[PDB]
Amino acid sequence: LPEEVNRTLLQIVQAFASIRSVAEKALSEEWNNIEYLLTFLAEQAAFSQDTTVAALSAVLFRKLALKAPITHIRKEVLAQIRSSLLKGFLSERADSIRHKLSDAIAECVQDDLPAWPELLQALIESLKSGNPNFRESSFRILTTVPYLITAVDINSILPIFQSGFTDASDNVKIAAVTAFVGYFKQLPKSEWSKLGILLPSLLNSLPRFLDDGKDDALASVFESLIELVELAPKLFKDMFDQIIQFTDMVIKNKDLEPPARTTALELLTVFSENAPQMCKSNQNYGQTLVMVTLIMMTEVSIDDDDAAEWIESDDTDDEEEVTYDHAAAALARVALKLGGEYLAAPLFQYLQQMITSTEWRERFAAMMALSSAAAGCADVLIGEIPKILDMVIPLINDPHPRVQYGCCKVLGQISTAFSPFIQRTAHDRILPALISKLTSECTSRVQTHAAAALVAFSEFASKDILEPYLDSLLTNLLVLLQSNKLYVQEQALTTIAFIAEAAKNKFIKYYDTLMPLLLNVLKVNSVLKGKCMECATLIGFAVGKEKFHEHSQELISILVALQNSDIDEDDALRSYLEQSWSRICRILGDDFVPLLPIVIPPLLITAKATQDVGLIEEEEAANFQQYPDWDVVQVQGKHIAIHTSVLDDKVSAMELLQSYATLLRGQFAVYVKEVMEEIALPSLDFYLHDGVRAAGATLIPILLSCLLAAEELVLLWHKASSKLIGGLMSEPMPEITQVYHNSLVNGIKVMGDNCLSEDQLAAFTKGVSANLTDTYERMQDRDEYNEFTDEDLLDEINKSIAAVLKTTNGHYLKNLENIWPMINTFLLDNEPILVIFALVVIGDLIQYGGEQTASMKNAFIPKVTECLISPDARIRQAASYIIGVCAQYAPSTYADVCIPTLDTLVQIVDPGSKLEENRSSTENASAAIAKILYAYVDTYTANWFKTLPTITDKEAASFNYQFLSQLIENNSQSNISAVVDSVIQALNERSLTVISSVKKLLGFLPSSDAMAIFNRYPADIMEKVHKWFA
């Protein structure tokens, strides 16, 4: 560099340590100059004797070299920069500076950059150096630029890693493992088999960390191995037992500090999430996992045998019980993946023993383990339920209050995991057990947890089941209500609320005494009051409006006070208040209308939150990640920070707006324009958060329907429908695409006839085509290393097509021709889901195309007649519906098919026909033959009859009993009790004036003959029969 340039730059870069903003401007405004600057910073990083200037420049070089980019730099310069960076690397640098140089070097290696064989050469040599920092930095560069691993000869690179894993320096070891795993995460699988052979060297180097007593570095290695399990679990198959036994050995060594033990556990557990067939095939995995988690769950209340503190603390979790926490989450996670088939047996082997230990911590552990495993092992444990209670319930009264708390937890957790069966079956055992912990004989923590577990029970308990226990439940909870710790009172209110919600009308009895207790609590602590208001309005919904009106006015005045009071935190309160207002609206019906000006404005504010995004820089993201309320993602290389909490809050507000609109109907009309234009619609352009986009879409038809019920409607609908249609081509998530289709369907049902314009119809077609294209392409996707959203999307596209055909009244058949190639490929694909989709489109075509489909007759009836006898019941269903609809709307043009196939229908109708799983299919066939018999000798109709009654499909049933009513009133035994029953069953099962026809038939018989038909029927259906007949 020219000598002047140097002292200019030297001054500036020196200003950076500390004057610093003036230097920042100078760089970004002035520094035509980029290659000079890069050349300078690489010189400083390389040769400067000042640490800080060296570091800075290295980091700056790294940043500016991406931005340039390095590609657009002059080869003559690149070379000089490469050579000074390399000279700096091999000179004498501080460790931290070598690391920074390494990262700068890495910015100079690129597929389309000129080859740099001096770097490879320098790495091969540095890996053999006696200075650990040279060795470490070489693996670092292979970490950042894994492709260099491809560029070394295989017979050099393999010893480099084997040496790496075995190195004297832990830091070199960590870097070797990092680079090894990095290789897999960066390169395609076709390259994997080239390092994969090294896994055993790695695994075999693991015991050395325990010999050196270097378990903290073990933890780092475990972390890289955890990533390798996510990428290539099958790689570990051959040495599976050796990693299992090794992690067993580490976890048991309670002398190690927790990180080596918790990361070892995570290694163990992650196999279950990435290779479930693998761990299932190995009996050792499940057994080690359970054994190991039971041990860790024992590590509680350490140095506090009486649990004194623990008793004197409050119901939040002690987050310092780390190994215990991780073990419970591990057990849970593994149980969820592997199931009880595989896990119950090993679990129970151990529980039997620990339940009876004199060590309280082991009795606790056993409760907590069941609690963690129950959901996951539900499939098997739902049948071993008295056995479980026989083990757990005796401990409800354990000397030690933590075992008691533990037992409350399991009873709670199991009530939810084994629901609804356990409520029906074990109320007699569970409720007394829990109720007895409510009494003030027990400790605060235990009473509260028992009350918590009663919520879990109640959630799936009948009003009828809870009824005999309410007085007892209530009297005990009211005591807790007067408790003296906050958390006991809070939980008392929540438990009462949720019991009340389950009790429904059976709670009317307790209303007079409870509500003033609650008013007194409110008139006196934010969470308490919010939980109190929640309890009041849940009680209100349980007992109904009339009853709730005795206190509603006062309640509302307290709500208002609570909402509009100075202190705005707890933020926890806002939500209790919102749900309460909303629940008062379900209670009050239209009498809520006067309250809208209190309740809606805050929800409008929250629901208009913008996409609160920070287009951000590379370092400025990991600290932005610290916040629970924020997440950072990458879109197209560029990084962005998104305020997740705020967007979540937006959704929640939109959900409330949507449910007020749904209940208030026409009364909500005043808000429709504002919610639609400022909330619903702009929410579809929220490309960073799909919840928002979905909540936007679902709001649309409900908004319209509110306006309808009360020109603008048409304007909003046109704007809304257009944004939905356009969304179909641009939306990347298939799950969202479905919401838009569903949203359109619902919109079209609101708006009625001819609600879409011709350009809209054509734009919907392109959307439908792109969506069908992308679904085909995803399904033509599905290994050496690894082990309904499509059906749902297609289900909805069928609904939108049907809906659009109906609104156009056929005219959409024109547009529909453009995507016929698509529909056709589907129809003759192998994949049953695409086939069913196509069949369903075809059925809709004929409904509207009538005899206007002849164009295609010759092209799809061949496959439809196939489909008729398909082993798949859903394919028969769609096919037969097509055949039936053919005779209905396109009669004259389809008899060459309908009448032949008629025998096929007699067959499809007849082992496992009348059976839940194919009852649906054979009902369509049944109606399909009735349709043919109507359009166009008598042997057939006697067949048809033997397929009544029609109970499951509503449109099919609609036709069959319409037909059954013609075959009588305009036509012509001992079929009379089968005739009647066929009808009673249909009505009773809620599938479908056929009654008028039946009466006349009963007219043809003696009073006594007529009355005996009903003999069979019990009271409940004879109550209904009386109210059905003429």
UniProtKB/Swiss-Prot annotation:
HEAT repeats lie at residues 3-31, 34-68, 75-108, 117-144, 154-186, 195-231, 239-274, 283-338, 340-374, 378-418, 420-460, 463-503, 505-543, 546-588, 590-664, 667-710, 712-751, 758-808, 811-849, 857-889, 897-936, 938-969, 975-1004, 1007-1030. The keyword Acetylation applies. GO terms for cellular component: cytoplasm; nucleus. GO terms for molecular function: nuclear import signal receptor activity; nuclear localization sequence binding. This is Importin subunit beta-3. One of its GO terms (biological process) is mRNA export from nucleus. It is found in: Cytoplasm; Nucleus. PANTHER family: IMPORTIN BETA. Keywords: Acetylation, Cytoplasm, Nucleus, Phosphoprotein, Protein transport, Repeat, Transport. InterPro entries: ARM-like (IPR011989), ARM-type_fold (IPR016024), Importin_beta (IPR040122), Importin_rep_4 (IPR041653), Importin_rep_5 (IPR040928), Importin_rep_6 (IPR041389). Functions in nuclear protein import as nuclear transport receptor. Serves as receptor for classical and arginine/glycine-rich nuclear localization signals (cNLS and rg-NLS) in cargo substrates. Its predominant cargo substrate seems to be ribosomal proteins and ribosome biogenesis trans- and cis-acting factors. Required for nuclear transport of YAP1, NOP1 and SOF1. Mediates the nuclear import of histones H3 and H4. Mediates docking of the importin/substrate complex to the nuclear pore complex (NPC) through binding to repeat-containing nucleoporins. Plays a role in protein secretion. The keyword Transport applies. It comes from Saccharomyces cerevisiae (strain ATCC 204508 / S288c). Interacts with Ran (GSP1); interacts specifically with the GTP-bound form of Ran (GTP-Ran), protecting it from GTP hydrolysis and nucleotide exchange. Interacts with RPL25; this interaction is dissociated by binding to Ran-GTP. Interacts with YAP1; this interaction is dissociated by binding to Ran-GTP. Interacts with NOP1; via its rg-NLS. Interacts with SOF1; via its cNLS. Interacts with histones H3 and H4; via their NLS. Interacts with ABF1. The gene is PSE1.
